[PDB]
Design a protein around this nucleic acid. Structure first.
Ligand code: CA
Ligand code: CA
Ligand code: CA
Lengths: 350, 993, 209
DNA sequence: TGAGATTAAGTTAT
DNA sequence: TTTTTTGATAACTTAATCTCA
């Protein structure tokens, strides 16, 4: 009818095609408007489009709108808004589709992207310098090219002995198992969770160039791997008893009662971050507790919060204790409540 | 024109647009007034001061306050205050449509703007000042400003209203009559001119009658006019031609009638007359404008109203006449299956008659205040003045051989075949007349009989007009809705509130600009409570709230401008903190906090806050509606003349209707009163109120002379100012020992079962319980009333139940009524020989279980004996009563291939006779003792609706027997023969939930 | 046919059988009186299947005495309605070839007339002569179409009643209007993208001239 | 070898 | 030949679905 309706229909058409990369929630409401004004429309109310350069081994995600995973609906947060810091390659340079970022040991890397031609994608990668997949424009071709991170292949255009967990970052411990003296690429816990491998047992694992790769089981995993090594997502994490050190490390500020407040006030960006997010969310991010498990644990509890401070937490439903991750997290809940109290006091003082 | 009373309002859709006014003086003359009409805009001083034309006309509207009403989720306690702008918006009139940038105070069409800018009640009488009035034509007095011309208003007066109750009888050869091939036969008019001179006309078309018949009629005292000018208005029968009849019809219609009334008229009658007139003569009904400037060439337009989760035909004349149709109005009020002329007459005209004399066929009846209460006898006599067919005992219809109305009743002499007893039910039901066969062989005697039938049809339209009080209804609608009289029965609840809402806004000087993307969440939660058990056999007391939803809407001030914020939480580590913040920052008796169900799935708690400081638009609109209904319903208790029903009887009904839809409008998305949080809070508080009432009467003991309520008496929302003592000081007789158990509760109704069985004790107990509940249980404006004593309560389902209604007046020996709330009896789904059997079985079980045995099982054996008498014998079709087998099933619209998948429903063939979307339908679907179950819904379609069926057939039978047995086994408990009930015939086992 | 003596096509097969019966009731009187279109613009737009004209335009006024049958077909450009449509098309695109704009010669667009015949200077008057035929005639178009172009605004308000099946349709302001409220915003390209929403090729309104 | 759980929707009642 | 449309849900009812085959 009017220009607004034309714009609405154009954007409906635009988001209809780019639905597997999510917008999809608002897409249903878009169909609702169309089914009324025109009495019907041509449409009805989480993986890469088929399409398809070595694979940067890790956790792969795709983003095109402005980060969902092809394997499942895994859209998590990003450090310091890297996606917006890189502007929008999709909008600025049309032709590329579902730009792919791979995370490897808390380091974000970009793998090969599908366009047009790969030349413009490589030029954009050079312009916005994060990393490069390779320069092709399993022990040959890709073996000649060297990099600090493992790479195997997209295209070109054994016996274990014991268990030893590694360490990457702050309270982050990637899984690792030693074979008959190499580390098996089992950094993804779910693959280890879905396939529990007993130690000192032959396992069907294949090595291409550098390394090899393939509730009751979760109890065995939590008991064997250092006891107090819970699941914080794709990796493991220890209890990590700490006070202001973790708060300073996460906020990227100098270690410091009034000293911390003065340090926060000195940096405007950190002050905005503090007064731009809820206390619970930032505390959970600082301690690295998984969002899914911690929400369930909190919902299944009977806190006695007074004056925005937890006094004596307790558990009510024992069923949630079936998951070993919640058991370990509930064990270190005192650290979380202390850090939450400290954060609330700091924000009240500010 | 000195003092003249307004009759209709309208406007001219010409090159220059004028808003007219038709009025009647104290004499019998029509006075027309004309005014200029403009589009109205209330933009601010900064949008119209900068435009190509200067202000053509402006008014000092005043400093208007605009509040932005919006709802936004807040995962915190930081809520920004509502932005209010006080400015100097000017009331601007422009004779042409301009697209202004501001566009404030929208969603008002054109007319309420005029009515409130100037100030006019669309129904009423005014002293039209001659200072401004100019004789622009013959009788049309046009003046410029409609503002000071109506400075003084006076009480209304009984004008000599003019009525044209017209009904035409056509040739129904085999299908529905059409304007192209079916000639008109028997146009009848109940012409009531401006002299109190009722004139009944039954003009027969002479192209069908022969010379002998018309000569005999003339000898009997009839006419054979050949021109329009020679017709006599004082006669009672005419034998005119088709073209002359159409010319007479055009002359009558073009006249400045106050009302032209029909039944199925706009769709059929008036359209038929018009289309026939232009088809035969070539003349067109030119409704001259009041100032004689615009010719309309009458054409009836169709208006469609459909709900996302109805076609009405209307007149387009612009001369002040209020052309009306009764079919559409009838299919708008209450809820009943009577949607046909004969059915409505049967349901409306009834009385009791005593057989004072018998005979071979003549059974004289008598009707007066002795047999019936009052009024119905007089109405029966009035219909009998032209009626000649009366239905007795619901199945016998006899032609009235002789009639005589002496002073207050009738002396009808029927053709009954020596009926037994002494007292019978005399009602104007349908007639044994076969219209198609009557028109098949058309002779003089049949012509006179059809003339009697058609004049009775016109007078019956008049009698339905008087019974429904349609003129009162139209006047009340005009007065309430601030609308022209021609538009009172074609606007739904969304637009009918705009007038009063606009008046309220202009009195309060608020615009309430609504920004885009306010709310989109689906709906609010609800709950239904199951009863305790399926058998009571004791007295059950019914308590009902007084318009609970409007009452809570005014209690909580649930308005979008009073909405502060919806604080929502996703976990419990923050829910406690923000809950404490809400409790400590918002004092209770200025902000109401409602724990509505969370709007988003990932939320566990949602609290909506409403500011009860300044009254909102909804709590003031419905308050005004309630006050108006209360004030306009007490006048009928004081008025003794015809005004008691002529004026002061439909105002309260219309105000009740408008108050009973405010809550529904408050949740409707694109409405002027939409507020999602308000609907959520209203529903939540209603559920809290029903829970509070139920769990205070669940186990209340009437020990000695006091009642101990179940739980404490505390306000379910905040800390009110009521006592919490559950014991009361009721004044029942001290020798009482009863226990109350709260069994069932609907939105505003609560049932409590009692140990007693006699009616009088239950009535007194319930009355004093009701008088104690409002004093102690309820608070503020929440009032309750005792409906009736429901003994023999049987909760057939969660909501469906059958009882024996006993009001606060019907004590013991008073004849009871089986008033129910959704059981088989009230629901239309049931059919013939289904309600009587279950009625008898339930009545037997009443005294079977009142004494108390818990082991008597003879009910099943007695039911088997009663059913086996006719269960096998009914298998012969024997002309089964099709007239009462079906249900409220209409020609449905939403379907894929067939609604309720079947053979030819919705899709269907030969269904001409009154078949369309929205019409209640009656129809029917050598192998006796049918075997197995074959999903018995075989022949379900929409075909020609008749009242006859074949015979000598052994067709299978429907859910009658199975449902009777299912209800019976729901009443009882033993399933010893449950399989054997239908294993031989169908094969199944009752659910017995 | 009894009045004005069909050559039914395979496309309009389930329509003509009831169409003749509906027509015969009116043809006894409408045909006798003179009408603005020639007594031929009744079944001319029936030949050939309608399996590719997925955009159908309908109008209620079959022009004054200089009628043409299908709407917007007069090769004179003097028509007020045709001139404004062509001006809007030129504004949107900018084609200089002017030989008479018409919405009929398109590989995927068919023009339709709401009322097949109307009298000289008598618009909106034939709300009863063609009322029954119109519903059945529009039913077949509704059965298979992508979008329907209705112009007339409140003139075409009563269209859901004649809409037997749910389809995509748009009701636009007529070129006459009241304050020339047609060139301000028409949003024609919506239909040009509507076919895209139904996985159908968009139609540029410049094919054939 | 009868016992159940949404459809497929309506279907009446505050 | 010109301004105009409509209240959300909660549930009992019959429906075959079909295979144990
Ligand atoms: Ca009639
Ligand atoms: Ca009639
Ligand atoms: Ca009530």
């Amino acid at each position: 009818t009017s220009s607004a309706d034309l714009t609405n229909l154009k954007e409906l058409l635009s988001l209809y095609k780019s639905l597997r990369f999510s917008a999809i929630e608002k897409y249903n409401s878009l169909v609702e408007w169309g089914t009324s004004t025109y009495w019907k429309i041509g449409v009805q109310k989480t993986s890469i489009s088929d399409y398809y350069l070595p694979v940067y081994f890790g956790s792969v995600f795709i983003y095109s709108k402005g980060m969902v995973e092809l394997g499942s609906g895994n859209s998590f947060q990003i450090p310091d808004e890297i996606r917006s810091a890189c502007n929008k390659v999709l909008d600025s340079d049309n032709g590329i589709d579902f730009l792919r970022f791979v995370l490897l040991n808390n380091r974000w890397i970009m793998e090969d992207a599908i366009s047009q031609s790969p030349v413009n994608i490589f030029k954009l990668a050079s312009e916005y310098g994060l990393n490069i997949p390779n320069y092709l424009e399993y022990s040959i071709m890709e073996r000649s090219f060297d990099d600090t991170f493992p790479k195997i292949s997209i295209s070109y255009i054994m016996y274990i002995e014991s268990i030893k967990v590694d360490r990457i970052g702050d309270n982050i411990f990637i899984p690792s198992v030693i074979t008959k003296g190499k580390k098996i690429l089992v950094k993804d816990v779910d693959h280890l969770i879905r396939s529990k491998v007993r130690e000192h047992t032959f396992v069907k694992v294949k090595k291409k160039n550098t390394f090899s790769i393939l509730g009751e089981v979760i109890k065995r995993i939590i008991d064997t791997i250092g006891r107090d090594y819970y699941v914080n997502g794709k990796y493991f994490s220890k209890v990590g008893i700490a006070g202001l050190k973790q708060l300073t490390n996460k906020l990227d500020i100098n270690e410091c009662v009034d000293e911390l407040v003065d340090e926060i006030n000195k940096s405007g960006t950190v002050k905005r971050k503090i007064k731009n997010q809820s206390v619970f969310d930032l505390s959970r991010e600082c301690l690295g507790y998984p969002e899914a498990d911690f929400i369930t644990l909190v919902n299944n509890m009977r806190f006695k919060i007074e004056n925005c401070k937890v006094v004596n937490f307790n558990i009510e439903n024992t069923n949630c204790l079936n998951n070993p991750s919640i058991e370990t997290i509930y064990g270190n809940f005192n650290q979380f409540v202390s850090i939450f109290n400290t954060v609330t006091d700091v924000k009240k003082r500010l | 024109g000195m003092d003249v009373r307004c009759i209709n309002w309208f406007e001219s859709h010409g090159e220059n647009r004028f808003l007219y006014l038709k009025s009647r003086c104290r004499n019998g003359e029509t006075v027309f007034i004309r005014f200029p009409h403009y589009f109205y805009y209330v933009v601010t001083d900064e949008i119209y001061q900068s435009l190509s034309p200067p202000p053509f006309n402006a008014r000092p509207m005043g400093k208007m306050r605009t509040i932005d009403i919006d709802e936004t989720i807040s995962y915190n306690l930081d809520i920004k205050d509502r932005k209010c702008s006080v400015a100097d918006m000017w009331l601007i009139e422009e004779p042409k449509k301009r697209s202004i940038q501001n566009a404030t105070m929208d969603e008002f069409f054109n007319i309420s703007w005029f009515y409130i800018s100037n100030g006019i009640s669309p129904d009423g009488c005014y002293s039209l000042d001659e200072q401004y009035l100019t004789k622009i034509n013959n009788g049309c007095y046009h003046c410029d400003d409609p503002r000071n011309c109506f400075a003084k208003e006076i009480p209304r007066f009984d004008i000599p209203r003019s009525y044209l109750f017209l009904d035409i009888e056509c040739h129904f050869d085999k299908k529905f009559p059409s304007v192209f091939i079916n000639p008109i036969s028997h146009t009848s008019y109940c012409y009531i001119d401006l002299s109190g001179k009722r004139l009944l006309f039954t003009l027969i078309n002479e192209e069908m009658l022969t010379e002998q018949e018309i000569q005999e009629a003339v000898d009997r005292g009839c006419l054979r006019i050949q021109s329009l000018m020679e017709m006599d208005y004082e006669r009672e029968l005419v034998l005119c031609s088709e073209i002359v009849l159409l010319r007479i019809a055009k002359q009558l219609l073009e006249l400045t009638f106050d009302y032209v009334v029909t039944f199925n008229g706009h769709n059929f009658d008036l359209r038929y007359i018009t289309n026939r007139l232009e088809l035969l003569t070539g003349e067109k009904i030119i409704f001259r404008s009041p100032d004689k400037k615009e010719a309309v060439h009458l054409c009836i337009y169709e208006r469609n109203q459909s709900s996302h989760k109805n076609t009405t035909f209307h007149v387009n004349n612009n001369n002040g006449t209020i052309f009306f149709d009764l079919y559409s109005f009838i299919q708008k009020s209450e809820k009943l299956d009577s949607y046909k002329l004969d059915s409505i007459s049967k349901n409306a005209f009834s009385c009791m008659g005593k057989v004072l004399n018998r005979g071979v066929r003549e059974m004289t009846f008598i009707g007066d205040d002795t047999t019936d209460a009052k009024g119905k006898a007089d109405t029966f006599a009035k219909v009998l003045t032209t009626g000649n067919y009366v239905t007795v005992d619901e199945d016998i219809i006899c032609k009235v051989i002789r009639k005589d109305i002496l002073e207050n009743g009738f002396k009808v002499v029927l053709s009954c075949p020596t009926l037994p007893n002494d007292i019978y039910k005399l009602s104007f039901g349908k007639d044994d007349i076969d219209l198609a066969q009557m028109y098949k062989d058309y002779n003089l005697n049949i012509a006179l009989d059809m003339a009697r039938y058609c004049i009775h049809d016109a007078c019956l339209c008049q009698y339905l007009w008087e019974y429904y009080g349609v003129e009162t209804k139209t006047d009340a609608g005009a007065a309430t809705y601030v609308l022209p009289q021609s538009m009172v029965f074609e606007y739904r609840a969304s637009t009918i509130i705009k007038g009063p809402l606009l008046k309220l806004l202009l009195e309060t000087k608020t615009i309430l600009v609504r920004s885009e993307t306010k709310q989109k969440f689906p709906y609010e939660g609800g709950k239904v409570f199951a009863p305790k058990q399926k058998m009571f056999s004791n007295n059950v007391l019914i308590f009902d709230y007084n318009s609970l939803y409007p009452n809570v809407c005014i209690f909580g001030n649930l308005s979008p401008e009073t909405l502060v914020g919806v604080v929502v939480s996703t976990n419990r580590l923050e829910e406690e903190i923000n809950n404490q913040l809400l409790l400590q920052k918002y004092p209770p008796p200025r902000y109401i906090t409602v724990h509505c169900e969370p709007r988003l799935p990932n939320l566990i708690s949602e609290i909506a806050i409403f500011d009860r400081s300044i009254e909102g638009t909804i709590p003031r609109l419905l308050r005004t509606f309630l006050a108006e209904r209360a004030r306009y319903k007490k006048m009928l208790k004081q008025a003794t003349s015809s005004t008691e029903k002529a004026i002061y009887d439909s105002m309260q009904y219309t105000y009740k209707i408008v108050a009973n839809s405010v809550y529904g409008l408050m949740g409707f998305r694109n409405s002027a009163l939409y507020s999602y949080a308000s609907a959520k809070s209203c529903t939540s508080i209603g559920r809290r109120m029903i829970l509070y009432l139920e769990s205070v009467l669940n186990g209340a003991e009437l020990s000695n002379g006091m009642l101990r309520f179940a739980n404490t008496l505390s306000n379910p929302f905040y800390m009110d100012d009521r006592d919490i003592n559950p014991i009361v000081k009721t004044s029942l007789p001290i020798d009482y020992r009863f226990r109350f158990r709260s069994v069932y509760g609907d939105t505003d109704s609560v049932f409590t079962e009692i140990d007693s069985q006699d009616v009088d004790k239950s009535i007194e107990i319930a009355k004093e319980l009701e008088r104690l509940i409002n004093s102690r249980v309820l608070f503020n404006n929440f009032k309750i009333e005792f409906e009736a004593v429901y003994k023999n309560l049987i909760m057939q389902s969660k909501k469906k139940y059958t009882t024996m209604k006993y009001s606060a007046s019907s004590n013991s020996k008073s004849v009871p009524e089986r008033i129910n709330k959704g059981t088989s009896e009230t629901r239309r789904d049931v059919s013939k020989f289904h309600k009587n059997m279950i009625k008898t079985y339930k009545t037997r079980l009443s005294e079977m279980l009142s004494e108390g045995r818990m082991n008597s099982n003879q009910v099943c054996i007695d039911i088997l004996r009663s059913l086996e008498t006719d269960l096998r014998s009914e298998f012969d079709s024997r002309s089964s009563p099709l007239e009462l087998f079906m249900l409220s099933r209409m020609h449905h619209s939403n379907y894929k291939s067939a609604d309720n998948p079947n053979m030819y429903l919705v899709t269907e063939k030969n269904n001409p006779e009154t078949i369309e979307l929205g019409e209640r339908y009656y129809f029917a679907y050598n192998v006796p003792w049918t075997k197995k179950l074959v999903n018995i819904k075989t022949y379900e379609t929409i075909i020609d609706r008749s009242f006859k069926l074949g015979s000598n057939q052994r067709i299978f039978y429907e859910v009658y027997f199975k449902r009777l047995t299912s209800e019976i086994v729901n009443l009882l408990d033993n399933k010893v023969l449950c399989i054997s009930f239908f294993q031989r015939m169908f094969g199944s086992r009752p659910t017995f939930y | 046919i009894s009045h004005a003596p069909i050559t039914y096509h395979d496309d309009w097969e389930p329509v003509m059988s009831q169409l003749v019966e509906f027509y015969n009731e009116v043809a006894s009187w409408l045909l006798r009186d003179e009408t603005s279109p020639i007594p031929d613009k009744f079944f001319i737009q029936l030949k050939q299947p309608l399996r590719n004209k997925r955009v159908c335009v309908c109008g209620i006024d079959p022009y004054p005495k200089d009628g043409t049958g299908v709407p917007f077909e007069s090769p004179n450009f003097t028509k007020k309605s045709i001139k404004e449509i062509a001006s809007s098309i030129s504004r949107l695109t900018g084609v200089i070839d002017y030989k008479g704009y018409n919405l009929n010669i398109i590989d995927g667009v068919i023009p339709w007339n709401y009322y097949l015949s109307c009298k000289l200077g008598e618009t909106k008057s034939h709300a009863i002569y063609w009322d029954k035929i119109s519903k059945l005639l529009l039913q077949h178009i509704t059965k298979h179409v992508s979008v329907l172009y209705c112009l007339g605004k409140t003139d075409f308000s009563n269209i859901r009643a004649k809409l037997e099946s749910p389809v995509t349709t748009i009701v636009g302001y007529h070129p006459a209007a009241r304050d020339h409220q047609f060139e301000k915003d028409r949003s024609f390209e919506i239909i040009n993208v509507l076919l895209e929403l139904d996985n159908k090729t968009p139609i540029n309104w410049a094919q054939g001239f």
